[PDB]
From a paper:
The lectin pathway of complement is activated by complexes comprising a recognition component (mannose-binding lectin, serum ficolins, collectin-LK or collectin-K1) and a serine protease (MASP-1 or MASP-2). MASP-1 activates MASP-2, and MASP-2 cleaves C4 and C4b-bound C2. MASPs are homodimers that circulate as zymogens bound to the collagenous domains of MBL. Each MASP comprises two N-terminal CUB (C1r/C1s, Uegf, and bone morphogenetic protein-1) domains separated by an epidermal growth factor (EGF)-like domain followed by two short complement regulator (SCR) domains and a C-terminal serine protease (SP) domain.
Because there was no structure of rat MASP-1 3D, and the existing structure of rat MASP-2 3D lacked two of the three Ca2+, including those Ca2+ that form part of the binding site for MBL, both rat MASP-1 3D and MASP-2 3D were crystallized in the presence of 2 mM calcium and diffraction data were collected. This resulted in one MASP-1 structure at 3.7 Å resolution and three independent MASP-2 structures at 2.6–2.7 Å resolution. For MASP-1 3D, 276 of its 281 residues could be built into the electron density map. All four crystal structures revealed a dimer of MASP-1 3D or MASP-2 3D, formed by antiparallel neighboring contacts between pairs of CUB1-EGF domains about the crystallographic symmetry axis. The total buried surface area for MASP-1 at the dimer interface was 880 Å2 per molecule (1,760 Å2 in total), whereas the three crystal structures for MASP-2 gave 1,200, 1,090, and 950 Å2 per molecule. All four new crystal structures revealed well-ordered, similar calcium-binding sites in each of the CUB1 and CUB2 domains. In the MASP-1 CUB1 domain, Ca2+ formed contacts with six oxygen atoms in the side chains of Glu49, Asp57, Asp102, Ser104, and Asn105 (distances between 2.3 and 2.4 Å). In the MASP-1 CUB2 domain, Ca2+ now formed contacts with five oxygen atoms in the structurally equivalent side chains of Glu216, Asp226, Asp263, and Ser265. The EGF domains of MASP-1 and MASP-2 also bound calcium. Interestingly, the prediction of 4.26 S from the MASP-1 3D crystal structure was similar to the observed value of 4.53 ± 0.08, while that of 4.18 S from the MASP-2 crystal structure was close to the observed value of 4.09 ± 0.07 S.
Residue numbers in the entry:
A (entry chain A), B (entry chain A): 2 to 277
The structure:
């Protein structure tokens, strides 16, 4: 017999329970909960004892993995009997398999068990350091969601937290510009625009101070994050890595700057200055 | 503004949040979950400080009870500010009340909070020693249910555990009869029938030995549990209390016995004997 249901919980007995389970009986149960993990325990366990539970037995098994097997009598110690132990499936699926091989010598009362559903905690994260909340984790029953620190705006991915850097321009002859939340790690999934223009008769110079930190690779030139600068009709970039690019001078009075940062990385960002 | 919704959880901000909450603002929120208790915490708290939070404030209040009040700034210590503390409603209802009295001197950013639902555990029972599981408690998410020990049958009340004593008769001249699971407390909500008949020429005698324990009152004669015996056309009973009734003889060969036990009480029951 193959029986399948869900609810939030359930009750499962051996055939003929509380009385002795019939000979050569083979039964299976598929158990699923949508957002949760399956928890199961045994209120009563009495079965035929054998070597590695070959004859009579109960088997807790997931899709790709077998969780456990149980047989024998709960009264006898040093057994493989489940007793008061509680089996919990990693995934949202659990399958139970009861088998009576051929015949019982002495009649065994069988087993009585009860399952239920348990909320997966994504703040404890279960499986850890996978795709998960950037800043703030919030776990409700049957799922979770994320939020951001004051000043940070939640990105469309519902996971990472971005900021708005596009609202700034620099008028003065001299000054110093940084990355958002410098020296601290720059906000993920963000595009920053820094524009500097001057009245004619002024040539503009640029220098990189302090620490320079951007996620990079010995491979192709800055696939993840980068900085690129536009002066007149000519551009300079992309720039990344630990080593800061050498100081650069620009004839034109008009300069635009782009700093793009991806969804990943803890990289701390940069700082530079400008004078005419 | 009066806003009400449920889901499993939610997010609540002050008016105009993250920016300063407008002057003379008064808002209320009704929050309900069907089977659960309402849990609430604050991710951000910034409000106008005052005496006992008279001016600007947030108020967590149930139907018949006020849970807490909060005001001031989270940055300042020795405050009444909620901070990292978590408010939990005893019942399934929670109401939030935000008020800005008249006007802000300095603009306060307001507050950001998140609620959710939490399973009521009936095995820990919350409020304890109320109507609850006789033998075995099982708590799932959003409710519970009960079961019984091996040999006990669950009564229609879904709570108490009964037994079937009606399937026994006593043929022999001499013998001793007891209550179910004697000396241990008799099963609740049960009706037991013990029948004894003999061939003619025999008169039957009765005596009460050992302990005699039945739930009773100095008031009216055994409203809760009792024993009553039927011999011929005459009856004897009801009998209860600690003191056992005196030995009784019966002319007739036919005797029927009834022992009725209610939903309550731990009383241990009785034992007696019969000889002809
Ligand atoms: C029950 O689970 C088994 C495990 O492999 C699967 O083969 C079978 O199709 C499932 N049946 C139902 C009705 O889900
Ligand atoms: C993000 O959350 C919103 C909720 O408003 C939902 O509509 C959207 O489908 C979600 N997208 C992703 C990629 O999770
Ligand atoms: C909200 O709760 C208050 C508390 O007394 C009650 O008076 C009001 O009727 C409730 N409104 C709704 C829509 O539930
Ligand atoms: C007891 O549980 C059964 C479930 O089969 C339900 O139908 C019935 O209404 C319940 N009665 C009480 C008094 O709880
Ligand atoms: Ca067998
Ligand atoms: Ca969850
Ligand atoms: Ca990065
Ligand atoms: Ca005010
Ligand atoms: Ca519950
Ligand atoms: Ca009683
Ligand atoms: Na930075
Ligand atoms: Na008893």
């Amino acid at each position: 017999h193959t029986v399948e249901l869900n609810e939030m919980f359930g009750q499962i007995q051996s055939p003929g329970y509380p009385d002795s389970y019939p000979s050569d009986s083979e039964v299976t149960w598929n158990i699923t909960v949508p957002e949760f993990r399956v928890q199961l325990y045994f209120m009563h366990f009495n079965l035929e004892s054998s070597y590695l539970c070959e004859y009579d037995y109960v088997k807790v098994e997931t899709e790709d993995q077998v969780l456990a097997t149980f047989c024998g009598r709960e009264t006898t110690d040093t057994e493989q009997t489940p007793g008061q132990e509680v089996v919990l499936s990693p995934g949202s699926f659990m399958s139970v398999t009861f088998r009576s091989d051929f015949s019982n010598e002495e009649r065994f009362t069988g087993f009585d068990a009860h399952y239920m559903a348990v909320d997966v905690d994504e703040c404890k994260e279960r499986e850890d350091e996978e795709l998960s909340c950037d800043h703030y984790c919030h776990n409700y029953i049957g799922g979770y969601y994320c939020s951001c620190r004051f000043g940070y705006i939640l990105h469309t991915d519902n996971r990472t937290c971005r900021v708005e850097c596009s609202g700034n321009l620099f008028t003065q002859r001299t000054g110093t510009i940084t990355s958002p939340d410098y020296p601290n790690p720059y906000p993920k999934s963000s595009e920053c625009s820094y524009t500097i223009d001057l009245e004619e008769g002024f040539m503009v110079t640029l220098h990189f101070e302090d620490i320079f930190d951007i996620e990079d690779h010995p491979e192709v030139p800055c696939p993840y994050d980068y900085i690129k600068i536009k002066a007149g009709s000519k551009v300079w970039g992309p720039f990344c890595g630990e080593k800061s690019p050498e100081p650069i001078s620009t004839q034109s009075h008009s300069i635009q700057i782009l700093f793009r940062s991806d969804n990943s990385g803890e990289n701390r960002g940069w700082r530079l200055s400008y004078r005419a």
